[PDB]
Amino acid sequence: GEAPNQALLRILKETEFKKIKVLGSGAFGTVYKGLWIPEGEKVKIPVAIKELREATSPKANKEILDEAYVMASVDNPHVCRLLGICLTSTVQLITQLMPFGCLLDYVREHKDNIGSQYLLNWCVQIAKGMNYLEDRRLVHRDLAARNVLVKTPQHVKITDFGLAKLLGAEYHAEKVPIKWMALESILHRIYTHQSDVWSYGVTVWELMTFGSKPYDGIPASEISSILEKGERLPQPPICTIDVYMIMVKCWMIDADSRPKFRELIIEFSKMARDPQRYLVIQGDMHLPSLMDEEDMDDVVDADEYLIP
Protein backbone atom coordinates (compact mmCIF):
# COMPACT_ATOMS: atom_id res chain seq x y z
CA GLY A 1 0.00 0.00 0.00
CA GLU A 2 2.85 2.37 -0.85
CA ALA A 3 2.42 4.76 -3.77
CA PRO A 4 5.01 4.97 -6.58
CA ASN A 5 6.99 8.21 -6.31
CA GLN A 6 6.68 9.57 -9.85
CA ALA A 7 8.44 12.86 -9.07
CA LEU A 8 10.69 14.18 -11.84
CA LEU A 9 14.38 14.85 -11.18
CA ARG A 10 15.31 17.60 -13.64
CA ILE A 11 18.95 17.61 -14.74
CA LEU A 12 20.13 21.15 -15.49
CA LYS A 13 22.95 22.23 -17.80
CA GLU A 14 25.64 24.32 -16.11
CA THR A 15 25.18 26.83 -18.94
CA GLU A 16 21.57 27.41 -17.88
CA PHE A 17 22.41 29.36 -14.70
CA LYS A 18 24.90 32.00 -13.55
CA LYS A 19 26.16 32.38 -10.00
CA ILE A 20 26.11 35.93 -8.65
CA LYS A 21 26.96 36.08 -4.93
CA VAL A 22 28.09 33.72 -2.19
CA LEU A 23 25.36 33.49 0.45
CA GLY A 24 27.50 31.44 2.86
CA SER A 25 30.12 28.71 2.87
CA GLY A 26 31.78 26.28 5.27
CA ALA A 27 30.42 23.11 6.85
CA PHE A 28 29.08 21.47 3.68
CA GLY A 29 30.20 23.22 0.51
CA THR A 30 29.00 26.67 -0.58
CA VAL A 31 25.54 28.17 -1.12
CA TYR A 32 25.33 30.69 -3.96
CA LYS A 33 22.58 32.91 -5.30
CA GLY A 34 21.99 33.48 -8.99
CA LEU A 35 19.64 33.34 -11.95
CA TRP A 36 18.51 30.28 -13.90
CA ILE A 37 17.62 30.88 -17.56
CA PRO A 38 16.26 27.70 -19.20
CA GLU A 39 17.52 27.69 -22.77
CA GLY A 40 14.88 28.76 -25.26
CA GLU A 41 12.39 30.07 -22.70
CA LYS A 42 13.10 33.79 -22.16
CA VAL A 43 12.73 33.67 -18.37
CA LYS A 44 15.16 34.49 -15.57
CA ILE A 45 14.43 32.67 -12.31
CA PRO A 46 16.17 33.74 -9.06
CA VAL A 47 17.63 30.54 -7.60
CA ALA A 48 19.93 29.39 -4.81
CA ILE A 49 22.70 26.99 -5.85
CA LYS A 50 24.29 24.67 -3.27
CA GLU A 51 27.34 22.66 -4.37
CA LEU A 52 29.58 20.24 -2.48
CA ARG A 53 33.10 21.64 -2.11
CA GLU A 54 36.07 19.49 -3.16
CA ALA A 55 34.06 16.41 -4.10
CA THR A 56 37.27 14.50 -4.90
CA SER A 57 37.00 12.11 -1.94
CA PRO A 58 33.65 12.99 -0.34
CA LYS A 59 31.10 10.13 -0.43
CA ALA A 60 28.79 12.70 1.20
CA ASN A 61 27.10 12.82 -2.21
CA LYS A 62 24.92 10.05 -0.79
CA GLU A 63 23.73 12.77 1.62
CA ILE A 64 23.15 15.61 -0.86
CA LEU A 65 21.30 13.29 -3.25
CA ASP A 66 19.04 12.08 -0.44
CA GLU A 67 18.06 15.72 0.14
CA ALA A 68 17.43 16.14 -3.59
CA TYR A 69 15.22 13.04 -3.62
CA VAL A 70 13.09 14.53 -0.84
CA MET A 71 13.04 18.07 -2.25
CA ALA A 72 11.93 16.80 -5.68
CA SER A 73 9.01 14.83 -4.19
CA VAL A 74 7.35 17.74 -2.33
CA ASP A 75 4.96 20.29 -3.83
CA ASN A 76 3.31 22.71 -1.41
CA PRO A 77 3.19 26.54 -1.24
CA HIS A 78 4.90 26.26 2.18
CA VAL A 79 7.67 23.77 1.32
CA CYS A 80 10.83 24.43 -0.68
CA ARG A 81 10.85 22.32 -3.84
CA LEU A 82 13.97 21.36 -5.79
CA LEU A 83 14.22 22.98 -9.21
CA GLY A 84 16.94 20.63 -10.42
CA ILE A 85 20.42 19.28 -9.93
CA CYS A 86 23.57 19.85 -11.98
CA LEU A 87 25.96 16.92 -12.39
CA THR A 88 29.22 18.78 -13.04
CA SER A 89 32.51 17.97 -11.30
CA THR A 90 30.78 19.17 -8.12
CA VAL A 91 27.16 18.15 -7.55
CA GLN A 92 24.87 21.19 -7.32
CA LEU A 93 21.35 21.62 -5.96
CA ILE A 94 19.21 24.41 -7.44
CA THR A 95 16.13 25.65 -5.58
CA GLN A 96 14.03 28.80 -5.60
CA LEU A 97 15.81 31.79 -4.09
CA MET A 98 14.34 32.95 -0.78
CA PRO A 99 15.38 36.63 -0.77
CA PHE A 100 14.69 37.51 2.88
CA GLY A 101 16.73 34.67 4.37
CA CYS A 102 15.79 32.23 7.09
CA LEU A 103 13.08 33.20 9.56
CA LEU A 104 15.45 33.00 12.54
CA ASP A 105 17.76 35.77 11.31
CA TYR A 106 14.84 37.78 9.92
CA VAL A 107 13.10 37.72 13.30
CA ARG A 108 16.27 39.09 14.93
CA GLU A 109 17.13 41.87 12.47
CA HIS A 110 13.49 43.07 12.45
CA LYS A 111 12.27 42.46 16.01
CA ASP A 112 11.16 46.11 16.35
CA ASN A 113 8.97 45.86 13.23
CA ILE A 114 7.31 42.42 13.46
CA GLY A 115 3.61 42.49 14.28
CA SER A 116 1.38 39.93 15.94
CA GLN A 117 -0.34 39.47 12.57
CA TYR A 118 2.97 38.38 11.02
CA LEU A 119 3.90 36.06 13.89
CA LEU A 120 0.52 34.32 13.92
CA ASN A 121 0.45 34.02 10.12
CA TRP A 122 3.92 32.44 10.10
CA CYS A 123 2.75 29.89 12.68
CA VAL A 124 -0.16 29.00 10.39
CA GLN A 125 2.04 28.71 7.30
CA ILE A 126 4.64 26.53 9.02
CA ALA A 127 1.87 24.29 10.36
CA LYS A 128 0.40 24.03 6.85
CA GLY A 129 3.73 22.92 5.39
CA MET A 130 4.23 20.41 8.21
CA ASN A 131 0.68 19.11 7.78
CA TYR A 132 1.51 18.57 4.10
CA LEU A 133 4.66 16.66 5.05
CA GLU A 134 2.47 14.46 7.26
CA ASP A 135 0.17 13.74 4.30
CA ARG A 136 3.18 12.55 2.26
CA ARG A 137 4.28 10.41 5.25
CA LEU A 138 7.52 12.38 5.67
CA VAL A 139 9.12 13.18 9.04
CA HIS A 140 11.24 16.33 9.08
CA ARG A 141 13.32 15.53 12.20
CA ASP A 142 14.98 18.96 11.98
CA LEU A 143 12.25 21.59 12.29
CA ALA A 144 13.51 24.93 13.60
CA ALA A 145 13.40 28.65 12.89
CA ARG A 146 16.73 28.51 11.05
CA ASN A 147 15.24 25.97 8.61
CA VAL A 148 12.22 28.09 7.61
CA LEU A 149 12.98 30.40 4.69
CA VAL A 150 11.26 33.73 4.06
CA LYS A 151 10.27 34.29 0.43
CA THR A 152 8.42 37.47 1.41
CA PRO A 153 7.55 38.67 4.93
CA GLN A 154 4.08 37.33 4.09
CA HIS A 155 5.25 33.92 2.80
CA VAL A 156 7.55 31.44 4.54
CA LYS A 157 8.51 27.91 3.50
CA ILE A 158 9.98 24.86 5.24
CA THR A 159 13.38 23.70 4.00
CA ASP A 160 16.46 21.61 4.85
CA PHE A 161 15.44 17.97 4.38
CA GLY A 162 18.85 16.44 5.09
CA LEU A 163 17.62 14.56 8.15
CA ALA A 164 14.21 13.99 6.54
CA LYS A 165 13.08 10.36 6.33
CA LEU A 166 10.09 8.83 4.53
CA LEU A 167 7.98 6.49 6.65
CA GLY A 168 6.07 3.53 5.23
CA ALA A 169 2.37 2.74 5.26
CA GLU A 170 8.77 5.50 14.39
CA TYR A 171 12.03 5.81 12.44
CA HIS A 172 15.20 4.63 14.19
CA ALA A 173 18.47 6.46 13.49
CA GLU A 174 21.84 6.77 15.22
CA LYS A 175 24.89 14.67 15.17
CA VAL A 176 21.41 15.93 16.09
CA PRO A 177 19.81 19.21 17.27
CA ILE A 178 19.25 18.31 20.91
CA LYS A 179 17.16 21.23 22.16
CA TRP A 180 14.48 20.86 19.44
CA MET A 181 13.84 17.12 19.81
CA ALA A 182 10.98 15.38 21.60
CA LEU A 183 11.80 13.33 24.69
CA GLU A 184 11.35 10.02 22.87
CA SER A 185 13.78 11.19 20.19
CA ILE A 186 16.44 11.82 22.85
CA LEU A 187 16.23 8.54 24.75
CA HIS A 188 14.89 6.09 22.16
CA ARG A 189 15.85 7.96 18.95
CA ILE A 190 12.25 7.54 17.78
CA TYR A 191 10.99 10.13 15.29
CA THR A 192 7.29 10.47 14.49
CA HIS A 193 5.11 13.18 12.98
CA GLN A 194 4.30 13.94 16.62
CA SER A 195 8.02 14.27 17.29
CA ASP A 196 7.89 17.09 14.72
CA VAL A 197 5.06 18.72 16.70
CA TRP A 198 7.47 19.07 19.63
CA SER A 199 10.03 20.70 17.33
CA TYR A 200 7.18 22.88 16.05
CA GLY A 201 6.54 23.96 19.63
CA VAL A 202 10.18 24.93 20.05
CA THR A 203 9.99 26.74 16.70
CA VAL A 204 6.99 28.79 17.82
CA TRP A 205 8.88 29.64 21.01
CA GLU A 206 11.75 30.90 18.85
CA LEU A 207 9.45 33.34 17.04
CA MET A 208 7.65 34.68 20.13
CA THR A 209 11.01 35.29 21.84
CA PHE A 210 12.22 36.94 18.60
CA GLY A 211 15.08 34.46 18.21
CA SER A 212 16.28 33.55 21.70
CA LYS A 213 18.26 30.34 22.02
CA PRO A 214 16.16 27.64 23.72
CA TYR A 215 17.76 26.47 26.97
CA ASP A 216 20.46 29.11 26.51
CA GLY A 217 23.39 28.41 28.80
CA ILE A 218 22.47 24.79 29.54
CA PRO A 219 24.57 21.77 28.51
CA ALA A 220 23.01 19.49 25.93
CA SER A 221 23.46 16.35 28.04
CA GLU A 222 21.43 17.72 30.97
CA ILE A 223 18.37 18.30 28.76
CA SER A 224 17.21 14.66 28.91
CA SER A 225 16.84 14.88 32.70
CA ILE A 226 15.19 18.30 33.13
CA LEU A 227 12.58 17.30 30.54
CA GLU A 228 11.73 14.20 32.58
CA LYS A 229 11.65 16.45 35.66
CA GLY A 230 8.65 18.32 34.22
CA GLU A 231 10.42 21.49 33.05
CA ARG A 232 9.76 23.29 29.76
CA LEU A 233 10.57 26.59 28.09
CA PRO A 234 9.30 29.77 29.79
CA GLN A 235 6.30 31.78 28.68
CA PRO A 236 7.60 34.45 26.29
CA PRO A 237 6.68 38.02 27.26
CA ILE A 238 4.40 38.84 24.31
CA CYS A 239 2.68 35.46 24.76
CA THR A 240 -0.76 35.31 26.28
CA ILE A 241 -1.65 32.12 28.11
CA ASP A 242 -3.72 31.24 25.02
CA VAL A 243 -0.65 31.04 22.78
CA TYR A 244 1.64 29.60 25.46
CA MET A 245 -0.91 26.88 26.26
CA ILE A 246 -0.61 25.65 22.67
CA MET A 247 3.18 25.71 23.02
CA VAL A 248 2.86 23.68 26.22
CA LYS A 249 0.65 21.01 24.63
CA CYS A 250 3.32 20.40 21.98
CA TRP A 251 5.80 19.53 24.76
CA MET A 252 3.75 16.84 26.50
CA ILE A 253 5.48 13.55 27.22
CA ASP A 254 2.58 11.42 25.97
CA ALA A 255 3.17 11.89 22.25
CA ASP A 256 -0.38 11.06 21.15
CA SER A 257 -1.93 13.71 23.43
CA ARG A 258 -0.02 16.42 21.52
CA PRO A 259 -1.77 18.59 18.91
CA LYS A 260 -2.01 17.43 15.32
CA PHE A 261 -0.71 19.73 12.60
CA ARG A 262 -4.22 19.97 11.14
CA GLU A 263 -5.37 21.29 14.52
CA LEU A 264 -2.49 23.75 14.99
CA ILE A 265 -3.49 25.32 11.66
CA ILE A 266 -7.01 25.90 12.97
CA GLU A 267 -6.05 27.31 16.38
CA PHE A 268 -3.52 29.77 14.97
CA SER A 269 -5.84 30.70 12.10
CA LYS A 270 -8.49 31.60 14.67
CA MET A 271 -5.94 33.75 16.49
CA ALA A 272 -4.73 35.37 13.26
CA ARG A 273 -8.37 36.52 12.97
CA ASP A 274 -7.70 38.85 15.94
CA PRO A 275 -3.94 39.04 16.49
CA GLN A 276 -3.66 41.59 19.31
CA ARG A 277 -5.96 39.55 21.59
CA TYR A 278 -3.31 36.80 21.71
CA LEU A 279 0.07 38.57 21.29
CA VAL A 280 0.87 41.74 23.24
CA ILE A 281 3.54 43.68 21.35
CA GLN A 282 4.47 47.29 22.10
CA GLY A 283 3.14 49.28 19.15
CA ASP A 284 1.17 47.03 16.81
CA MET A 285 4.35 49.01 12.13
CA HIS A 286 4.95 47.59 8.64
CA LEU A 287 7.22 45.15 6.83
CA PRO A 288 8.80 45.46 3.34
CA SER A 289 7.66 44.06 -0.01
CA LEU A 290 13.95 44.40 -4.81
CA MET A 291 15.02 44.06 -8.46
CA ASP A 292 18.72 44.05 -7.40
CA GLU A 293 21.24 44.39 -10.22
CA GLU A 294 21.11 43.76 -13.98
CA ASP A 295 18.44 43.70 -16.70
CA MET A 296 15.45 42.37 -14.76
CA ASP A 297 12.78 42.63 -17.47
CA ASP A 298 11.92 38.93 -17.96
CA VAL A 299 12.28 37.90 -14.30
CA VAL A 300 9.87 35.18 -13.15
CA ASP A 301 9.71 33.94 -9.57
CA ALA A 302 9.96 30.16 -9.41
CA ASP A 303 6.45 29.68 -7.99
CA GLU A 304 5.10 30.86 -11.37
CA TYR A 305 7.40 28.72 -13.56
CA LEU A 306 5.54 25.40 -13.86
CA ILE A 307 6.78 22.93 -16.49
CA PRO A 308 4.77 19.65 -16.26
Ligand SMILES: *CCC(=O)Nc1ccc(OC)c(Nc2cc(-c3[nH]c(SCCOC)nc3-c3ccc(F)cc3)ccn2)c1
Ligand atom coordinates in the same frame (compact mmCIF):
# COMPACT_ATOMS: atom_id res chain seq x y z
C1 LIG B 1 19.58 31.69 8.35
C2 LIG B 1 20.04 30.59 7.40
C3 LIG B 1 20.01 31.10 5.97
O1 LIG B 1 20.16 30.34 5.07
N1 LIG B 1 19.81 32.52 5.72
C4 LIG B 1 19.77 33.09 4.38
C5 LIG B 1 20.48 34.41 4.09
C6 LIG B 1 20.44 35.02 2.69
C7 LIG B 1 19.68 34.30 1.57
O2 LIG B 1 19.64 34.85 0.28
C8 LIG B 1 19.51 36.24 0.26
C9 LIG B 1 18.97 32.98 1.86
N2 LIG B 1 18.25 32.33 0.77
C10 LIG B 1 18.21 30.90 0.54
C11 LIG B 1 19.17 29.93 1.24
C12 LIG B 1 19.10 28.46 0.96
C13 LIG B 1 20.06 27.52 1.69
N3 LIG B 1 20.70 27.83 2.79
C14 LIG B 1 21.45 26.78 3.16
S1 LIG B 1 22.53 26.69 4.62
C15 LIG B 1 22.70 28.33 5.37
C16 LIG B 1 23.54 29.22 4.46
O3 LIG B 1 22.84 30.40 4.18
C17 LIG B 1 22.60 30.61 2.82
N4 LIG B 1 21.27 25.81 2.26
C18 LIG B 1 20.42 26.24 1.35
C19 LIG B 1 19.95 25.42 0.15
C20 LIG B 1 19.10 24.17 0.38
C21 LIG B 1 18.63 23.34 -0.81
C22 LIG B 1 19.01 23.76 -2.22
F1 LIG B 1 18.59 23.01 -3.29
C23 LIG B 1 19.86 25.00 -2.45
C24 LIG B 1 20.33 25.83 -1.26
C25 LIG B 1 18.07 27.95 0.00
C26 LIG B 1 17.13 28.92 -0.70
N5 LIG B 1 17.21 30.37 -0.42
C27 LIG B 1 19.01 32.39 3.26
